[PDB]
């Protein structure tokens, strides 16, 4: 429902950045960097949900989803 209070603690909004390599072909995999965006304490053992990586032209060039590795 539109009018409701959700107060989550296990979810963080993040920005994912990656490099599109030369001569990249569909189906190949690349590394991504996940950075928190607002008042999150940690991203220790989180899992990145399906994220479309846009280019400068605002077109989806990659789809990101995986487990984050934080140093510790």
């Amino acid at each position: 429902p539109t009018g409701t209070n959700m107060q989550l603690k296990n979810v963080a909004a993040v920005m994912v950045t990656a490099s599109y390599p030369p001569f990249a072909r569909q189906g190949q995999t690349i590394d991504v960097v996940v950075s928190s965006m607002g008042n999150a304490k940690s991203l220790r053992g989180g899992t990145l949900l399906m994220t479309p990586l846009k280019g400068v032209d605002s077109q989806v060039y990659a789809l990101a989803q995986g487990n984050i590795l934080v140093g510790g």
Binding site: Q26, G27, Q59, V60, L63
Partner: protein, 37 residues
């Protein structure tokens, strides 16, 4: 005077039928994008 045929302000059709989408390609991917603008 109210029976005189008149042209409405919003002429044309006031509805659009969703166009069926392209058939996915056989590349082994679930993500399939229509002709990108």
């Amino acid at each position: 005077c109210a029976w005189i045929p008149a042209k409405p302000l919003v002429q044309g059709a006031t509805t659009a039928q969703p166009i069926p989408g392209p058939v996915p390609v056989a590349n082994g991917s679930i993500f399939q994008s229509a002709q990108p603008i």
